Amino acid sequence: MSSKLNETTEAIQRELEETTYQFKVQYNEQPMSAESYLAASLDDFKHQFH
Amino acid sequence: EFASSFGRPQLQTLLKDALDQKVLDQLAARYWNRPIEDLSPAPREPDNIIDLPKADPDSPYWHRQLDTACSGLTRLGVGRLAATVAASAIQQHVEKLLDKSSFAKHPSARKVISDAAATVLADRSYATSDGIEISLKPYKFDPDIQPNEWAQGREHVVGVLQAELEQCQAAMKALENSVGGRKKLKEVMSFVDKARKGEIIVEGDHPSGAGGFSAALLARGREAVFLRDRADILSLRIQAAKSRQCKTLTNKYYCPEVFLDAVATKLAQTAVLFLNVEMLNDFYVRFPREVEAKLHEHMHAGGGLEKFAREDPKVRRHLDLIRRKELLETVLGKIEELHRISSG
Amino acid sequence: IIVEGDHPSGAGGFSAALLARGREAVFLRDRADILSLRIQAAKSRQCKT
């Protein structure tokens, strides 16, 4: 296990990196949560209703 | 001299070409016709490209289509595309300069030089890509198009599109002459159109003979129909790009060709500026030191100095002549030393 | 020309059915010619005796 640990660790760092790059180019690293989405859309609806 | 020659508009043309084919791919995949494989009716999409000039301006289909086309073009690795294109270009130009240089022979020294250029570009590549994506961050959100940019895209789209059409028509006519008569291929085309509509059914995954046409002739007929539809679409989009309605910028959703070409040109140019500064100047500054260090270390560490001399024909004759002369001189020196050590 | 098929589906642009129709047409042609030739022979002077 300890011997495979180095190769596995570097590979995990790799798959983390490409996930991070797509997070940078397509969403501009913008944070998102379900609660944030709901609240923003509710206020959009309330602007529409007003 | 090369560094004085290369500059930045060259990088502009280089990036604009990669992004040109990016535009054709995105536009064709979002708007034009898909290939025919079998002889079943294709699922008919409600909106068609032939009715685009006469379409409701607030069309959710066309709006969503041009918008997902543009967002797909922008949210691509344009930073990494520019960095790798400029890298391969600079390395290639260094290789050509090497071809014309005094290092045509000596593949060891030549490869040392080439590898030096490669390692410098590799070192700077990341900073250039990330900096380009940051500098393009505002144009990803709103690539607002100015009327002159719209005009430039207008002039470019006609050429890009007509080149695509000429290849298409030449392939169609060659198909006709290969299959035989124009009228015969027109017959197979009529049959494939019939099977594509409800008029006739064949029930085959591999139809051998229907209406008297071979398994190969059916394939040629489907290919002919695809070429036909794509040719008509292409000519129509060319006449539309030359249309009066596409001269103005306000019909952006009505002229996807011109708009997408404008976005391509813009992203290419602003990415090109940061590319030139962050990467090109860094190359001009680091490359000579790296060449000198690596060549000197190579000659003296590897003993490739003497082999570098042995490699060229003229210099081999020159240095060989000098060596035999050297041996004879040293022999005479040994004799003269002998006379000195022993008086008589 | 060669076709390399034990059952040829499409050759020169002709269907598996159209090939069958063409073979049938050639058989009928040759048999028609043979038949008319044997009629000309049965009416010939050499068959009178």
Swiss-Prot record, chain A:
Protein name: Dynamin-like GTPase MGM1, small form
Span of the entire protein shown here: 517 to 566 of 939
Gene this protein is translated from: MGM1
Cellular location(s): Mitochondrion intermembrane space
Biological role stated in the UniProt entry: Constitutes the soluble short form (S-MGM1) generated by cleavage by PCP1, which plays a central role in mitochondrial inner membrane fusion and cristae morphology. The transmembrane long form (L-MGM1) and the S-MGM1 form higher-order helical assemblies that coordinate the fusion of mitochondrial inner membranes. Inner membrane-anchored L-MGM1 molecules initiate membrane remodeling by recruiting soluble S-MGM1 to rapidly polymerize into a flexible cylindrical scaffold encaging the mitochondrial inner membrane.
Swiss-Prot record, chain C:
Location(s), subcellular: Mitochondrion intermembrane space
Protein purpose: Constitutes the soluble short form (S-MGM1) generated by cleavage by PCP1, which plays a central role in mitochondrial inner membrane fusion and cristae morphology. The transmembrane long form (L-MGM1) and the S-MGM1 form higher-order helical assemblies that coordinate the fusion of mitochondrial inner membranes. Inner membrane-anchored L-MGM1 molecules initiate membrane remodeling by recruiting soluble S-MGM1 to rapidly polymerize into a flexible cylindrical scaffold encaging the mitochondrial inner membrane.
Protein name listed in UniProt: Dynamin-like GTPase MGM1, small form
Species name: Chaetomium thermophilum (strain DSM 1495 / CBS 144.50 / IMI 039719)
Gene name in the database record: MGM1
Residues included from the entire protein: 766 to 814 of 939
